[PDB]
Amino acid sequence: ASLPHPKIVKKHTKKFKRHHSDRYHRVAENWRKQKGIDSVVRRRFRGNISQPKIGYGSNKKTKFLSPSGHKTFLVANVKDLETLTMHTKTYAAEIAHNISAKNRVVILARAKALGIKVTNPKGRLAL
């Protein structure tokens, strides 16, 4: 149902993990660059982790595309959803986490009427 697009290519699926995040607990996994003088990671020795850099940039025609083929958009109320009336083929709505269950019902009902795809049509559903 989405707009046709070329094949999705990422060139790197593995998340870039901070060096020694697996060794010391206080070293969080969020990527920081190693600024050490004799750090093998900074010197790019063979057999070590690969640093993030611009060469891994994804295709512009593919950037920000969900595997379904849409661009994710965050919606908070009914009025917000109407901004996607004419852009169903490119954008998909997604209810914010802080939306009440009752307000989620009216959001999903409106989206179905207008054919707007919803990425998470299961949040806070009582069944």
Partner: protein, 167 residues
């Protein structure tokens, strides 16, 4: 609001493709494949069965008969890339293969709603095979041991080298 807005939206209109310049022309099939040669099936249900080649069909395929009376391979369609053309030649003049075409074989795929696990043949396919092969076997019966040769199944042994083998 949660996410403010995108200032520009991509166009919803789909664009037409460019004028492709890839025309279609028939194959230049290998000279070893001659109507009336004996072939070997390298794949499928009837793999390894020595068979006879009849006609080059329009959808890049070869019309093939067993004969069905000898070994049990009926009138069937194959692809030239999965068979081996032997040096044995069968004179196939005097048989009407022009009746057979790409539309002569259809599958009539069933609807996905109807799914069967318990489980037939067309009468015309039976008689078409019966007419053709009985005309052929009048010719196979000339060369000695070839009738048994078609009934046999091809198989590699120890020591054989296909790069040095002859067919």
């Amino acid at each position: 609001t949660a996410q403010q807005a995108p200032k520009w939206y991509p166009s919803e209109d789909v664009a037409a493709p460019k004028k492709t310049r890839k025309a279609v022309r028939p194959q230049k099939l290998r000279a070893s494949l001659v109507p009336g040669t004996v072939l070997i099936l390298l794949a499928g249900r009837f793999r390894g069965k020595r068979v006879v080649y009849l006609k080059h069909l329009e959808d890049n395929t070869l019309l093939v008969t067993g004969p069905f009376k000898v070994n049990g391979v009926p009138l069937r369609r194959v692809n030239a890339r999965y068979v081996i053309a032997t040096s044995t030649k069968v004179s196939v003049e005097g048989v009407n293969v022009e009746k057979f075409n790409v539309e002569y074989f259809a599958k009539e795929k069933l609807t996905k709603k109807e799914k069967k696990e318990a489980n037939e043949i067309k009468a015309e396919r039976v008689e078409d095979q019966k007419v053709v092969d009985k005309a052929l076997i009048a010719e196979i019966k000339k060369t000695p041991l070839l009738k048994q040769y078609l009934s046999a199944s091809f198989s590699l042994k120890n020591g054989d080298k296909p790069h040095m083998l002859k067919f």
